[PDB]
């Protein structure tokens, strides 16, 4: 039937890596797509440390640039997954004539109406069993900077909750120091209905993600209603470790219905 | 039903890896009863340090040498080496052999101790030089020209993960980084000597399609210097703990009874 190919770049979360997404990238490309994982700034391999940076424009530096090298005429579908909802939001409201559609994988999804903060203080607000996660801080400009360092049960019992035993260690081995800079992200302008508003926007969730809640991610979809919304059966936090067929599925029907000559 | 000794394995990554690696083997380990614990050697996997930062075996082994002094009183180890992380192991061996119970060569380099210690990688380097892709770089470090190598994505799938899922080629071409075998700094080391690596059980592990360690060259390292025990692993291909990973704990767990059974006696 009817099939386009289309170019994704997937995003990480605070404290991981385009590593993440190793699952994925092979599936998309057997299906004729060009599949880009990035690391942002100080997460996977990136040579920076955390405390080289302290803002989400920093951070999110490497997929500008990349988002900068697409060619003329040429879209991307951006795929964030937890808090790489706002580096593609961000990245949506600098380059709106650069993205088709924008998928949200068990993922922050920021407004218009409020500041950039608002869904990551209300998951703040929801969420506080942080278990053995360690949270520490550092000076950036005048600001303390709070970062996280995710525990052996937060990754197996919150995070990789339905996920195979070897991908909880292969992150154990992987996860880096992260922060969400919420000084900076709470008082960036607010996205706007030109920008971030302009965009298709995705939401697809995992009935059985253990550290965004069922109440929680619906909370997000009634805040700023999306286009359309998926949901993955048995899935964790991580779609794309615990039901990454399920979840390419529904990446190809996005990039169907994101279709244009 | 009775008892047995539990190992504690210690998992070393070869260069331009890390621990991540062995992702797929410590949770087998583990559920079987044993401990595992994999660490990035210097400048490796996510160790925030970079390769310009060092230029000798000693500096980029640290890690493991770390650990190693960690070990308590009277407890031992059994060090896994895969591909060059042989020599790691081989070093850490002659430094603490008094912690050391097995070591174990995963498609490894294995070094001898009649020869210097890079004796077994310049017959490597002379008996493969298909790199395809993958780019050879330098730096200073003291007085010396080091050379790097950076894995190609050819060279990572038609050569070292030539039988794994594809997915764990895409894995690797997400996390291998730049590193080097210090060569200038191997070959002018003191041999390893009897009383230190030259003491210790020594188990060679191969996989049946290696496409970078040959056959020849893993029967010629087996025959330069030989082991207590030799696995060939069919099937497997350089990473045997991405390819065949069932059967590769299968054979460290009979390791690991093995040296049960000689402290029950
Ligand atoms: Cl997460
Ligand atoms: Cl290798």
Same mark, same amino acid.
């Given at each position: 039937?009817?099939?386009?190919?289309? &170019?994704?770049? #997937?995003?990480?979360? =605070?404290? %991981?890596?385009?590593?993440?997404? @190793? !699952?994925?990238?092979?599936?998309?490309?057997?299906?004729?797509?060009?599949?880009?994982?990035?690391?942002?700034?100080?997460?996977?391999?990136?040579?920076?440390?955390?405390?080289?940076?302290?803002?989400?424009?920093?951070?999110?530096?490497?997929?500008?640039?990349?988002?900068?090298?697409?060619?003329?005429?040429?879209?991307?579908?951006?795929?964030?997954?937890?808090?790489?909802?706002?580096?593609?939001?961000?990245?949506?409201?600098?380059?709106?004539?650069?993205?088709?559609?924008?998928?949200? &994988?068990?993922? #922050?999804?920021?407004? =218009?109406? %409020?500041?950039?903060?608002?869904? @990551? !203080?209300?998951?703040?607000?929801?969420?506080?069993?942080?278990?053995?996660?360690?949270?520490?801080?550092?000076?950036?400009?005048?600001?303390?900077?709070?970062?996280?360092?995710?525990?052996?049960?937060?990754?197996?019992?919150?995070?990789?909750?339905?996920?195979?035993?070897?991908?909880?260690?292969?992150?154990?081995?992987?996860?880096?120091?992260?922060?969400?800079?919420?000084?900076?992200?709470?008082?960036?302008?607010?996205?706007?209905?030109?920008?971030?508003?302009?965009?298709?926007?995705?939401?697809?969730?995992?009935?059985?993600?253990?550290?965004?809640?069922?109440?929680?991610?619906?909370?997000?979809?009634?805040?700023?209603?999306?286009?359309?919304?998926?949901?993955?059966?048995?899935?964790?936090?991580?779609?794309?470790?615990?039901?990454?067929?399920?979840?390419?599925?529904?990446?190809?029907?996005?990039?169907?219905?994101?279709?244009?000559?």
């Amino acid at each position: 039937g009817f099939m386009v190919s289309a &170019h994704f770049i #997937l995003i990480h979360t =605070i404290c %991981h890596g385009a590593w993440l997404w @190793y !699952k994925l990238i092979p599936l998309l490309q057997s299906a004729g797509h060009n599949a880009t994982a990035i690391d942002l700034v100080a997460s996977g391999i990136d040579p920076r440390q955390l405390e080289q940076i302290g803002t989400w424009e920093q951070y999110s530096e490497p997929l500008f640039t990349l988002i900068e090298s697409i060619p003329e005429g040429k879209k991307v579908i951006l795929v964030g997954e937890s808090g790489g909802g706002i580096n593609i939001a961000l990245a949506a409201e600098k380059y709106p004539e650069k993205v088709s559609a924008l998928v949200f &994988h068990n993922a #922050l999804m920021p407004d =218009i109406d %409020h500041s950039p903060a608002f869904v @990551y !203080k209300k998951f703040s607000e929801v969420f506080t069993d942080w278990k053995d996660s360690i949270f520490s801080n550092y000076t950036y400009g005048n600001d303390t900077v709070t970062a996280v360092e995710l525990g052996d049960r937060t990754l197996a019992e919150n995070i990789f909750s339905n996920s195979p035993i070897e991908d909880v260690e292969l992150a154990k081995h992987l996860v880096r120091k992260g922060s969400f800079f919420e000084q900076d992200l709470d008082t960036l302008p607010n996205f706007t209905s030109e920008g971030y508003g302009s965009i298709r926007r995705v939401y697809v969730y995992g009935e059985e993600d253990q550290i965004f809640s069922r109440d929680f991610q619906l909370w997000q979809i009634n805040n700023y209603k999306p286009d359309k919304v998926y949901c993955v059966p048995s899935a964790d936090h991580k779609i794309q470790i615990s039901k990454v067929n399920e979840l390419a599925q529904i990446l190809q029907e996005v990039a169907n219905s994101a279709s244009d000559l």
